[PDB]
Amino acid sequence: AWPKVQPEVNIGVVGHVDHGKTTLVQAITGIWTSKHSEELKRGMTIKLGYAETNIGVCESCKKPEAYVTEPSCKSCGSDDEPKFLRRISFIDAPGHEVLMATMLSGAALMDGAILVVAANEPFPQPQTREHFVALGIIGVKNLIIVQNKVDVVSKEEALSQYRQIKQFTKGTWAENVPIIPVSALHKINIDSLIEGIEEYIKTPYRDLSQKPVMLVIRSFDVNKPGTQFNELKGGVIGGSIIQGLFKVDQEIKVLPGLRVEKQGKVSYEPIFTKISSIRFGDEEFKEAKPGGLVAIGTYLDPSLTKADNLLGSIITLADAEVPVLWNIRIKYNLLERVVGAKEMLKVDPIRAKETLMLSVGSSTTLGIVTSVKKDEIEVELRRPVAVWSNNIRTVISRQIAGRWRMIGWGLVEI
Numbered sequence: 218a219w220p221k222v223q224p225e226v227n228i229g230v231v232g233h234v235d236h237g238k239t240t241l242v243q244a245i246t247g248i249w250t251s252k253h254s255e256e257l258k259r260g261m262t263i264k265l266g267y268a269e270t271n272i273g274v275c276e277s278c279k280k281p282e283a284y285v286t287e288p289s290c291k292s293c294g295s296d297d298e299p300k301f302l303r304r305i306s307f308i309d310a311p312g313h314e315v316l317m318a319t320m321l322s323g324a325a326l327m328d329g330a331i332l333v334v335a336a337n338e339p340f341p342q343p344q345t346r347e348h349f350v351a352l353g354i355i356g357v358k359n360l361i362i363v364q365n366k367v368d369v370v371s372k373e374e375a376l377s378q379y380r381q382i383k384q385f386t387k388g389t390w391a392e393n394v395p396i397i398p399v400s401a402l403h404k405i406n407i408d409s410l411i412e413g414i415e416e417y418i419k420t421p422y423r424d425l426s427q428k429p430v431m432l433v434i435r436s437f438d439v440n441k442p443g444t445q446f447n448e449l450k451g452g453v454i455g456g457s458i459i460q461g462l463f464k465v466d467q468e469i470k471v472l473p474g475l476r477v478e479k480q481g482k483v484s485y486e487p488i489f490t491k492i493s494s495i496r497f498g499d500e501e502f503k504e505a506k507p508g509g510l511v512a513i514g515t516y517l518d519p520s521l522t523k524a525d526n527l528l529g530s531i532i533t534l535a536d537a538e539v540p541v542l543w544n545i546r547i548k549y550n551l552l553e554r555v556v557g558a559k560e561m562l563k564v565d566p567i568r569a570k571e572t573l574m575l576s577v578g579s580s581t582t583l584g585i586v587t588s589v590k591k592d593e594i595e596v597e598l599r600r601p602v603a604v605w606s607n608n609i610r611t612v613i614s615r616q617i618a619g620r621w622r623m624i625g626w627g628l629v630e631i
């Protein structure tokens with residue numbers, strides 16, 4: 218048998234709208250990540266999607282067919298059990314141009330990524346460029362490029378695009394990243410992709426001794442109709458642990474917390490609770506480490522967690538000292554081009570009184586620029602952000618022609 222363990226790595230799936238990200242995750246894991254009404258009606262990803270799979274290898278078989286996602290080798294001609302390698306998970310991002318901030322929130326959780334490029338569309342499309350640049354900014358450098366939809370183009374066309382893609386990465390951080398052609402729809406060459414994931418997206422080193430921090434991307438009420446009272450539960454909070462670890466029965470807090478009034482002023486009150494349960498996918502555990510999207514059960518009123526109410530928060534231990542800042546100072550750099558627009562315009566300098574969008578961890582917040590210098594801006598936010606370390610990366614967006622566009626990045630200085 219294979220062990221039941223949490224996923225140990227998060228692989229982002231990014232790329233232009235409809236290039237096949239979600240179909241690819243389904244080809245690997247058997248799971249369709251889209252769970253929301255609007256996603257199903259529109260045929261698009263809106264919220265971050267998630268799926269897990271075990272990975273193993275049939276030692277008696279040849280590669281790539283030796284790589285499997287279930288404990289059997291019958292497909293490659295062996296009655297032996299495959300050797301378990303690890304459990305992996307996917308963070309499935311939206312490709313739509315208006316959902317770039319959601320891709321950025323997911324990118325904060327990624328240990329590596331697959332950039333999906335459709336073989337039957339001109340290259341490079343706007344969000345092919347924009348997601349690529351975002352991965353570079355955030356430092357997600359363990360990248361595989363997947364050339365999808367090869368089932369609907371000729372060999373010649375696929376080869377032409379392949380050369381295009383290699384030339385695009387030439388002279389960039391991604392110069393040596395592999396390109397793997399697949400059909401996600403017809404599940405062609407998925408075994409080569411799993412081999413690629415093992416070779417190029419290794420599980421990173423973790424630091425389990427640092428103060429535990431989880432970035433929150435989901436929160437829910439898990440109580441369903443027709444359930445007996447003794448099976449009812451408190452609110453659940455979902456996210457990825459970026460350092461340290463968490464255990465059942467630990468006292469924790471959610472930051473910045475709840476928006477309340479305190480002395481005629483808006484304030485955020487930290488939400489204190491205790492971990493009642495820990496789950497990854499359909500499995501319960503007593504502790505949770507980095508890797509995977511964990512569901513942290515709490516004793517909170519489910520009205521507090523319902524419908525992603527806490528998206529963008531962080532969870533720490535109750536006694537941790539974490540800055541929660543309404544005003545932030547950013548050591549910044551600007552991109553030269555608005556890469557995500559259909560026509561790449563030049564980026565204008567930041568000016569005082571501009572409203573900008575700041576991506577910090579899993580959070581997205583608007584703020585007004587109160588001060589500009591050569592390498593520093595100060596921003597007054599509409600909601601405070603939890604800043605759990607010094608030199609946390611932020612991505613900066615500006616509204617241009619009715620869309621939020623990534624224009625720069627920086628370090629939050631505390």
Ligand SMILES: Nc1nc2c(ncn2[C@@H]2O[C@H](COP(=O)(O)OP(=O)(O)NP(=O)(O)O)[C@@H](O)[C@H]2O)c(=O)[nH]1
Pocket residue numbers: 232233234235236237238239240241260261262263310311312313365366367368369399400401402403
């Ligand atoms: N011919 C072909 N169609 C494919 C392939 N992969 C996906 N598609 C089709 O492309 C469309 C979009 O697929 P989807 O997986 O939703 O793409 P996405 O990149 O996740 N979209 P979004 O950016 O909105 O999340 C669907 O009609 C799907 O069936 C493929 O390998 N071949």
Ligand SMILES: Nc1nc2c(ncn2[C@@H]2O[C@H](COP(=O)(O)OP(=O)(O)NP(=O)(O)O)[C@@H](O)[C@H]2O)c(=O)[nH]1
Pocket residue numbers: 437438439440450453455494495496497498499512513514
């Ligand atoms: N820690 C914890 N997580 C739970 C519990 N029940 C459900 N979850 C998690 O909360 C999330 C929401 O689950 P749910 O609202 O039941 O819908 P769901 O995700 O469709 N359920 P399922 O995936 O099993 O069909 C999932 O990640 C699930 O694993 C619980 O008792 N404790």
Ligand SMILES: [Mg+2]
Pocket residue numbers: 238239240261262309310311312
């Ligand atoms: Mg999708």
